[PDB]
Amino acid sequence: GTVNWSVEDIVKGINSNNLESQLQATQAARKLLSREKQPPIDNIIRAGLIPKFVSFLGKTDCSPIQFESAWALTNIASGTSEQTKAVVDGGAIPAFISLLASPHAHISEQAVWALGNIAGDGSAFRDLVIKHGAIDPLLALLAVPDLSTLACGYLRNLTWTLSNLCRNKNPAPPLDAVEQILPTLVRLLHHNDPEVLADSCWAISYLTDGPNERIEMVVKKGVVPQLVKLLGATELPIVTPALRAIGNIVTGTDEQTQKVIDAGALAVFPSLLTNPKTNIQKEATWTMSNITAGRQDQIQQVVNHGLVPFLVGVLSKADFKTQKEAAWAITNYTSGGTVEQIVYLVHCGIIEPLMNLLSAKDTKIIQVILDAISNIFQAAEKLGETEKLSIMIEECGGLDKIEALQRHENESVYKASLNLIEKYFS
Ligand SMILES: C[C@@H](O)[C@H](NC(=O)CNC(=O)[C@H](CCCCN)NCc1ccc(-c2cccnc2)cc1)[C@@H](O)N[C@H](Cc1ccccc1)C(N)=O
């Protein structure tokens, strides 16, 4: 009986002095805003309905209209940024926080979902939600001895909303709020529900997307072994953020990187570096590029796990963005590796695919490769084997690729390749 109302009818209903008529119009409004094709959010907004919906949130005496208006507002707040703003400007945030305490689960859950949409909109709304004190009652809802006694959908919404409080940058969330949330998050990260695990991983991946101090704050909570385990999951919705998170951690200090290696991450990388999903392969290689920028003993652990041939593989054939990542991994490896580790690199076949990418119409990857070639010559210099390396590069057609770079637009390149020609090619 609340199917297909017009906005004018809804307004008439909501403007009556009759709580039941209001409830009926609100429900009608909810159903409109729920329809799949082009819900008329903006018409609803233009009709001045948000303030009325928000005031309906306070009707403790009429829980069904609390629920319908929460749902209606939620549909609106899950739209665009201006639509979300309209919900925030109607005073929704404290009214939703009050509803977290509702004795009716379906109402509390709706409030959880609404705050998640508002906080997920941007840094400023996220921080406004935190300032209105959302975190304490959100965490209080998860304060049970075993998470398994909570309804599955309920727990998924809470996790999702928690992950939005961790999301976005400029600024990152307040340090205080991260610390408040982190222990619950570590807990959710050990729960056995794929979606809760996915969203927990996303949350950790956001918190580790920053300066080493923020990375530290997560890593000191001991999540890395669990991340590595999730890194080995079969579900792509779990692997993807676990790898993003692991990728962020290895952009940190050598000590933070070492915890990733100690947890056994490198054992998962043969499958990641050959993963059929392009973005996994790409982020796996990025991750390697940060590990090969570590200490020589960390480069050595890459060698020991048999990962150099997989780096040669990615460099040889892959999506171009992934190959760019592999080039970095190589330059970083050659930059910091021992002479013996660089010799090993060449013996694995790095030279030919390295040269084939000198044909890439991209300035940065050329600089990166030319830099790597230079590092390898510097290793050959310490062994007096510069000439043998020269013959190697020449025979796989690499020399012609380098002379052609003499004839190149950018001159950071141009001149790097001429340094190479003069110095190592008669
Ligand atoms: C831009 C650059 O500053 C960010 N990436 C880093 O790895 C930063 N790391 C360092 O500077 C280390 C610290 C040493 C760490 C010690 N363990 N020094 C050696 C080093 C130098 C250069 C590279 C390099 C540069 C460019 C590309 N690939 C690798 C890697 C290591 C950027 O790529 N971030 C991603 C982008 C992305 C994420 C996922 C997929 C695709 C892209 C993101 N936030 O989404």
Side-chain angles (χ1 to χ4, degrees), residues 169 209 244 247-254 256-257 279 282-283 285-286 289-295 298 321 324-325 328-329 332:
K169 304 214 266 179
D209 187 9
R244 177 84 45 80
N248 289 337
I249 297 170
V250 299
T251 67
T253 62
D254 298 325
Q256 290 162 344
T257 300
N279 285 343
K282 188 233 293 165
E283 298 210 3
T285 309
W286 169 56
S289 83
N290 276 303
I291 303 179
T292 58
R295 328 183 209 106
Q298 290 175 330
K321 284 163 71 155
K324 219 174 171 193
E325 292 308 318
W328 274 109
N332 294 344

Short mmCIF file of all heavy atoms in Angstrom, two decimals, residues 169 209 244 247-254 256-257 279 282-283 285-286 289-295 298 321 324-325 328-329 332, ligand 1:
data_model
loop_
_atom_site.label_atom_id
_atom_site.label_comp_id
_atom_site.label_asym_id
_atom_site.label_seq_id
_atom_site.Cartn_x
_atom_site.Cartn_y
_atom_site.Cartn_z
N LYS A 169 42.52 10.51 3.50
CA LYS A 169 43.73 11.17 3.91
C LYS A 169 43.53 12.68 3.79
O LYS A 169 42.45 13.14 3.44
CB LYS A 169 44.93 10.72 3.05
CG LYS A 169 45.16 9.22 3.04
CD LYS A 169 46.66 8.89 2.95
CE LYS A 169 47.12 8.67 1.52
NZ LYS A 169 48.59 8.38 1.49
N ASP A 209 48.48 3.30 5.15
CA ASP A 209 48.78 4.17 4.03
C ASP A 209 49.21 5.56 4.53
O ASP A 209 48.46 6.53 4.45
CB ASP A 209 47.58 4.28 3.09
CG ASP A 209 47.92 5.04 1.80
OD1 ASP A 209 49.12 5.33 1.57
OD2 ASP A 209 46.99 5.33 1.02
N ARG A 244 47.41 -4.97 -0.31
CA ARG A 244 47.56 -3.52 -0.22
C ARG A 244 48.17 -3.16 1.15
O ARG A 244 49.12 -2.38 1.22
CB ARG A 244 46.21 -2.81 -0.41
CG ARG A 244 46.30 -1.30 -0.25
CD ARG A 244 46.74 -0.61 -1.52
NE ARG A 244 46.04 -1.14 -2.69
CZ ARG A 244 44.80 -0.82 -3.06
NH1 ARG A 244 44.08 0.06 -2.36
NH2 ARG A 244 44.26 -1.38 -4.14
N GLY A 247 51.74 -4.30 1.25
CA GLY A 247 52.42 -3.35 0.40
C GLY A 247 52.71 -2.04 1.12
O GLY A 247 53.78 -1.45 0.94
N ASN A 248 51.78 -1.55 1.94
CA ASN A 248 52.01 -0.29 2.64
C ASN A 248 53.06 -0.43 3.73
O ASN A 248 53.90 0.45 3.92
CB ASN A 248 50.71 0.24 3.23
CG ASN A 248 49.76 0.75 2.17
OD1 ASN A 248 50.18 1.11 1.07
ND2 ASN A 248 48.47 0.77 2.49
N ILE A 249 53.01 -1.54 4.45
CA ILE A 249 53.95 -1.78 5.54
C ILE A 249 55.39 -1.84 5.03
O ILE A 249 56.28 -1.30 5.65
CB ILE A 249 53.57 -3.05 6.30
CG1 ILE A 249 52.20 -2.85 6.94
CG2 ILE A 249 54.60 -3.38 7.38
CD1 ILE A 249 51.60 -4.10 7.52
N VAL A 250 55.64 -2.46 3.88
CA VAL A 250 57.02 -2.54 3.42
C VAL A 250 57.52 -1.22 2.83
O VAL A 250 58.69 -1.10 2.50
CB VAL A 250 57.21 -3.67 2.39
CG1 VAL A 250 56.87 -5.01 3.00
CG2 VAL A 250 56.39 -3.41 1.13
N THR A 251 56.66 -0.20 2.71
CA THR A 251 57.17 1.14 2.39
C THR A 251 57.78 1.80 3.64
O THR A 251 58.24 2.94 3.60
CB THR A 251 56.09 2.09 1.85
OG1 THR A 251 55.14 2.38 2.89
CG2 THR A 251 55.39 1.50 0.61
N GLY A 252 57.77 1.08 4.76
CA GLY A 252 58.25 1.62 6.02
C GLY A 252 59.74 1.41 6.26
O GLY A 252 60.54 1.34 5.32
N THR A 253 60.11 1.30 7.53
CA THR A 253 61.50 1.12 7.87
C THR A 253 61.92 -0.30 7.57
O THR A 253 61.07 -1.18 7.33
CB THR A 253 61.75 1.40 9.35
OG1 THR A 253 60.99 0.48 10.13
CG2 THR A 253 61.34 2.82 9.69
N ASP A 254 63.22 -0.54 7.61
CA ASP A 254 63.75 -1.87 7.40
C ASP A 254 63.25 -2.81 8.50
O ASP A 254 63.00 -3.99 8.24
CB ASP A 254 65.29 -1.84 7.36
CG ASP A 254 65.83 -0.99 6.19
OD1 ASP A 254 65.23 -0.98 5.10
OD2 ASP A 254 66.88 -0.33 6.37
N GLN A 256 60.25 -2.56 10.10
CA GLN A 256 58.85 -2.85 9.77
C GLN A 256 58.76 -3.81 8.59
O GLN A 256 57.93 -4.72 8.59
CB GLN A 256 58.08 -1.57 9.47
CG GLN A 256 57.87 -0.71 10.72
CD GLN A 256 57.51 0.72 10.40
OE1 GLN A 256 57.69 1.20 9.27
NE2 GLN A 256 57.02 1.44 11.41
N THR A 257 59.62 -3.62 7.59
CA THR A 257 59.70 -4.56 6.47
C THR A 257 60.09 -5.97 6.95
O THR A 257 59.54 -6.98 6.49
CB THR A 257 60.72 -4.09 5.40
OG1 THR A 257 60.31 -2.82 4.88
CG2 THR A 257 60.79 -5.08 4.26
N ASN A 279 45.75 -6.52 -11.27
CA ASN A 279 46.07 -5.65 -10.16
C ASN A 279 46.78 -6.37 -8.99
O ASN A 279 47.57 -5.73 -8.30
CB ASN A 279 44.81 -4.91 -9.69
CG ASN A 279 44.41 -3.79 -10.65
OD1 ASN A 279 45.21 -3.35 -11.49
ND2 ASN A 279 43.17 -3.32 -10.54
N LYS A 282 50.35 -6.65 -10.14
CA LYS A 282 50.92 -5.31 -10.11
C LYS A 282 51.29 -4.92 -8.67
O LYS A 282 52.40 -4.47 -8.41
CB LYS A 282 49.92 -4.31 -10.72
CG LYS A 282 50.45 -2.89 -10.93
CD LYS A 282 49.54 -1.85 -10.29
CE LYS A 282 48.18 -1.78 -10.97
NZ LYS A 282 47.16 -1.03 -10.14
N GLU A 283 50.38 -5.12 -7.73
CA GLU A 283 50.66 -4.73 -6.35
C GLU A 283 51.65 -5.67 -5.67
O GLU A 283 52.34 -5.28 -4.74
CB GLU A 283 49.36 -4.63 -5.55
CG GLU A 283 48.43 -3.55 -6.16
CD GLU A 283 47.50 -2.85 -5.15
OE1 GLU A 283 47.58 -3.13 -3.93
OE2 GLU A 283 46.66 -2.03 -5.61
N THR A 285 54.21 -6.83 -7.28
CA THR A 285 55.51 -6.43 -7.80
C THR A 285 55.95 -5.13 -7.13
O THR A 285 57.13 -4.96 -6.77
CB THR A 285 55.48 -6.26 -9.33
OG1 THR A 285 54.91 -7.43 -9.93
CG2 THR A 285 56.89 -6.09 -9.85
N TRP A 286 55.00 -4.22 -6.96
CA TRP A 286 55.22 -3.01 -6.17
C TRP A 286 55.79 -3.38 -4.81
O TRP A 286 56.79 -2.81 -4.37
CB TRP A 286 53.91 -2.24 -6.01
CG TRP A 286 53.97 -1.14 -5.01
CD1 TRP A 286 54.84 -0.09 -4.99
CD2 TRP A 286 53.11 -0.96 -3.87
NE1 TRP A 286 54.58 0.72 -3.92
CE2 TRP A 286 53.52 0.21 -3.21
CE3 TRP A 286 52.03 -1.69 -3.35
CZ2 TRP A 286 52.90 0.68 -2.06
CZ3 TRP A 286 51.40 -1.22 -2.20
CH2 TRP A 286 51.84 -0.05 -1.57
N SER A 289 59.32 -4.36 -5.10
CA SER A 289 60.16 -3.21 -5.36
C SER A 289 60.51 -2.50 -4.06
O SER A 289 61.57 -1.90 -3.96
CB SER A 289 59.48 -2.23 -6.31
OG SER A 289 58.58 -1.38 -5.62
N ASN A 290 59.63 -2.61 -3.06
CA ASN A 290 59.94 -2.01 -1.77
C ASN A 290 60.79 -2.93 -0.90
O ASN A 290 61.63 -2.47 -0.12
CB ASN A 290 58.65 -1.62 -1.05
CG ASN A 290 58.15 -0.27 -1.49
OD1 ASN A 290 58.86 0.73 -1.40
ND2 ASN A 290 56.96 -0.23 -2.07
N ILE A 291 60.60 -4.23 -1.03
CA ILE A 291 61.48 -5.15 -0.34
C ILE A 291 62.89 -5.14 -0.96
O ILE A 291 63.87 -5.26 -0.25
CB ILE A 291 60.91 -6.56 -0.35
CG1 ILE A 291 59.52 -6.57 0.28
CG2 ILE A 291 61.81 -7.54 0.39
CD1 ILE A 291 58.89 -7.95 0.27
N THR A 292 63.02 -4.97 -2.27
CA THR A 292 64.38 -5.00 -2.83
C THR A 292 65.12 -3.70 -2.56
O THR A 292 66.32 -3.61 -2.84
CB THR A 292 64.40 -5.28 -4.34
OG1 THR A 292 63.63 -4.28 -5.03
CG2 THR A 292 63.85 -6.68 -4.63
N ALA A 293 64.40 -2.72 -2.03
CA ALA A 293 65.00 -1.47 -1.57
C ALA A 293 65.45 -1.56 -0.12
O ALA A 293 65.85 -0.57 0.48
CB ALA A 293 64.02 -0.32 -1.72
N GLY A 294 65.38 -2.76 0.46
CA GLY A 294 65.77 -2.95 1.84
C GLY A 294 67.26 -3.22 2.00
O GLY A 294 68.06 -2.93 1.10
N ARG A 295 67.63 -3.77 3.15
CA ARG A 295 69.00 -4.16 3.40
C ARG A 295 69.40 -5.36 2.56
O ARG A 295 68.55 -6.14 2.08
CB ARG A 295 69.22 -4.52 4.87
CG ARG A 295 68.39 -3.77 5.89
CD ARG A 295 68.84 -4.25 7.27
NE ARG A 295 67.80 -4.19 8.30
CZ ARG A 295 67.15 -5.25 8.79
NH1 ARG A 295 67.42 -6.47 8.33
NH2 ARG A 295 66.24 -5.08 9.74
N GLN A 298 67.92 -8.52 3.31
CA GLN A 298 66.52 -8.62 2.89
C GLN A 298 66.44 -8.92 1.40
O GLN A 298 65.66 -9.77 0.99
CB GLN A 298 65.75 -7.35 3.26
CG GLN A 298 65.58 -7.26 4.78
CD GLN A 298 64.94 -5.96 5.25
OE1 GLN A 298 65.10 -4.91 4.62
NE2 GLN A 298 64.24 -6.03 6.38
N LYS A 321 52.03 -1.61 -16.65
CA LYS A 321 52.16 -1.00 -15.34
C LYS A 321 52.90 -1.91 -14.37
O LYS A 321 53.71 -1.45 -13.57
CB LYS A 321 50.79 -0.61 -14.77
CG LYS A 321 50.20 0.64 -15.42
CD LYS A 321 48.70 0.79 -15.17
CE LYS A 321 48.38 1.13 -13.72
NZ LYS A 321 47.07 1.86 -13.58
N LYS A 324 56.60 -1.81 -15.24
CA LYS A 324 57.15 -0.59 -14.62
C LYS A 324 57.52 -0.85 -13.15
O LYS A 324 58.62 -0.47 -12.70
CB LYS A 324 56.13 0.55 -14.73
CG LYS A 324 56.73 1.92 -15.03
CD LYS A 324 55.65 2.98 -15.27
CE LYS A 324 56.26 4.38 -15.37
NZ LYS A 324 55.24 5.47 -15.30
N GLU A 325 56.63 -1.52 -12.41
CA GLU A 325 56.92 -1.93 -11.03
C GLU A 325 58.14 -2.86 -10.95
O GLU A 325 58.98 -2.74 -10.05
CB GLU A 325 55.71 -2.63 -10.40
CG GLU A 325 54.52 -1.73 -10.15
CD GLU A 325 54.89 -0.47 -9.36
OE1 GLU A 325 55.67 -0.59 -8.39
OE2 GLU A 325 54.44 0.63 -9.73
N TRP A 328 61.39 -0.95 -11.35
CA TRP A 328 61.74 -0.40 -10.05
C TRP A 328 62.37 -1.43 -9.13
O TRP A 328 63.42 -1.17 -8.56
CB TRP A 328 60.52 0.20 -9.36
CG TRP A 328 60.27 1.62 -9.77
CD1 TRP A 328 59.25 2.09 -10.56
CD2 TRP A 328 61.07 2.76 -9.43
NE1 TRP A 328 59.36 3.45 -10.72
CE2 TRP A 328 60.46 3.89 -10.03
CE3 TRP A 328 62.22 2.94 -8.66
CZ2 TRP A 328 60.98 5.17 -9.90
CZ3 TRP A 328 62.73 4.22 -8.52
CH2 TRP A 328 62.11 5.32 -9.14
N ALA A 329 61.73 -2.58 -8.97
CA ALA A 329 62.27 -3.65 -8.15
C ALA A 329 63.70 -3.97 -8.54
O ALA A 329 64.54 -4.20 -7.67
CB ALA A 329 61.39 -4.91 -8.25
N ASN A 332 66.11 -1.01 -7.68
CA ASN A 332 66.33 -0.99 -6.23
C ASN A 332 67.22 -2.14 -5.78
O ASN A 332 68.03 -2.01 -4.86
CB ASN A 332 65.00 -1.03 -5.49
CG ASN A 332 64.18 0.21 -5.70
OD1 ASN A 332 64.69 1.23 -6.16
ND2 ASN A 332 62.89 0.15 -5.38
C1 LIG B 1 55.34 6.77 -5.43
C2 LIG B 1 55.97 6.18 -4.37
O1 LIG B 1 56.51 7.30 -3.47
C3 LIG B 1 54.97 5.22 -3.69
N1 LIG B 1 55.47 3.86 -3.59
C4 LIG B 1 56.57 3.36 -2.79
O2 LIG B 1 56.79 2.19 -2.85
C5 LIG B 1 57.48 4.23 -1.90
N2 LIG B 1 58.65 3.54 -1.38
C6 LIG B 1 59.96 4.17 -1.26
O3 LIG B 1 60.14 5.29 -1.61
C7 LIG B 1 61.11 3.31 -0.72
C8 LIG B 1 61.06 3.21 0.80
C9 LIG B 1 61.96 2.08 1.28
C10 LIG B 1 61.17 0.96 1.94
C11 LIG B 1 62.04 0.03 2.78
N3 LIG B 1 61.40 -1.27 2.90
N4 LIG B 1 62.40 3.76 -1.27
C12 LIG B 1 62.83 2.98 -2.45
C13 LIG B 1 61.74 2.96 -3.54
C14 LIG B 1 61.72 3.97 -4.49
C15 LIG B 1 60.73 3.96 -5.46
C16 LIG B 1 59.78 2.94 -5.48
C17 LIG B 1 58.68 2.94 -6.53
C18 LIG B 1 58.39 4.10 -7.22
C19 LIG B 1 57.37 4.07 -8.17
C20 LIG B 1 56.68 2.88 -8.36
N5 LIG B 1 56.98 1.79 -7.68
C21 LIG B 1 57.94 1.79 -6.77
C22 LIG B 1 59.78 1.93 -4.53
C23 LIG B 1 60.78 1.94 -3.57
C24 LIG B 1 53.72 4.94 -4.54
O4 LIG B 1 54.18 4.04 -5.51
N6 LIG B 1 52.72 4.37 -3.63
C25 LIG B 1 51.62 3.54 -4.13
C26 LIG B 1 51.34 3.58 -5.64
C27 LIG B 1 50.81 2.25 -6.20
C28 LIG B 1 50.26 1.29 -5.35
C29 LIG B 1 49.77 0.10 -5.84
C30 LIG B 1 49.84 -0.14 -7.21
C31 LIG B 1 50.39 0.79 -8.06
C32 LIG B 1 50.88 1.99 -7.56
C33 LIG B 1 50.32 3.93 -3.42
N7 LIG B 1 50.34 4.79 -2.24
O5 LIG B 1 49.28 3.54 -3.83
#
